[PDB]
Amino acid sequence: PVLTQSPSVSAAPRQRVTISVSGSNSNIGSNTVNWIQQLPGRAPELLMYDDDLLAPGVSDRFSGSRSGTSASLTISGLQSEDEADYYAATWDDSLNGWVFGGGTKVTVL
């Protein structure tokens, strides 16, 4: 993964959590960021796109941001169904293709 995130975070329900990803100028510095969610045992699905837009059918509790070569995904009011792996994705103009992060696990306690 050319994008790096934090590895793992465990949290109580209804708490705010913020995952972040760091890139470079060739990718996040000049291209919008998408967020992908994978619940345990399920296929990955699109969570957010265009830095801060909700993918169809995604809950109001997710928000996104991008600045410089970094981006973030915030979950307000953590729910049990949010326990999952979260991956950042973006376009890299140098590599000229999709680059991803290694993923961040959020565990709801």
């Binding site: 919008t32 992908i36 990955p44 265009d50 993918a55 994705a89 376009w91 991803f100």
Partner: protein, 174 residues
């Protein structure tokens, strides 16, 4: 020679994820992953690629990042063979001929199923009946009288020779 080398000769094998002109991601011996499809649409392109990588990693047992070894491709192919055989054994039109055949000719039938699908192979009513009755020459002729033979005559010739002889001769040549 085995069924893995046979399908490699007929379909090749990719060690890197490849997206064909129809948007399908593929790797190994014709193993299909996901199908790729305006900013939301490109986000779904990145999703489709990531889903393909996720299927591949789950099938192989490690984070491949799109690149697999030849042995991993073989493992994937063995999974695909097991799935295809299970399909055959659920198919009233293919199970009796498949059960009547020997291992080499069974490999030929599986080869056809990989190229055209269970329904496509099941369409060959007369030729399958001739195979179940071990009329090898006649099955070879009637199989040569098909659209499949006209589109891919070299593969079809190798599969047909395999049915006619019950040997690996059409593949061991090269």
């Amino acid at each position: 020679m085995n069924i893995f080398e046979m399908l490699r000769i007929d379909e090749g094998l990719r060690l890197k994820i490849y997206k064909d002109t129809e948007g399908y991601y593929t790797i190994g011996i014709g193993h299909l992953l996901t199908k790729s499809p305006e900013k939301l649409m490109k986000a779904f392109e990145s999703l489709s690629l990531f889903q393909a990588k996720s299927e591949l990693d789950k099938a192989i047992g490690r984070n491949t990042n799109g690149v697999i070894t030849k042995d991993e491709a073989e493992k994937l192919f063995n999974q695909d063979v097991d799935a295809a055989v299970r399909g055959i054994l659920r198919n009233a039109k293919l199970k009796p001929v498949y059960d009547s055949l020997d291992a080499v000719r069974r490999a030929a039938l599986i080869n056809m199923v990989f190229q055209m699908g269970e329904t496509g192979v099941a369409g060959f009513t007369n030729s399958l009946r001739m195979l179940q009755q071990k009329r090898w020459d006649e099955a070879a002729v009637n199989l040569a009288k098909s659209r499949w033979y006209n589109q891919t005559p070299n593969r079809a010739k190798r599969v047909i020779t395999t049915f006619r002889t019950g040997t690996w001769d059409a593949y061991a040549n090269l």
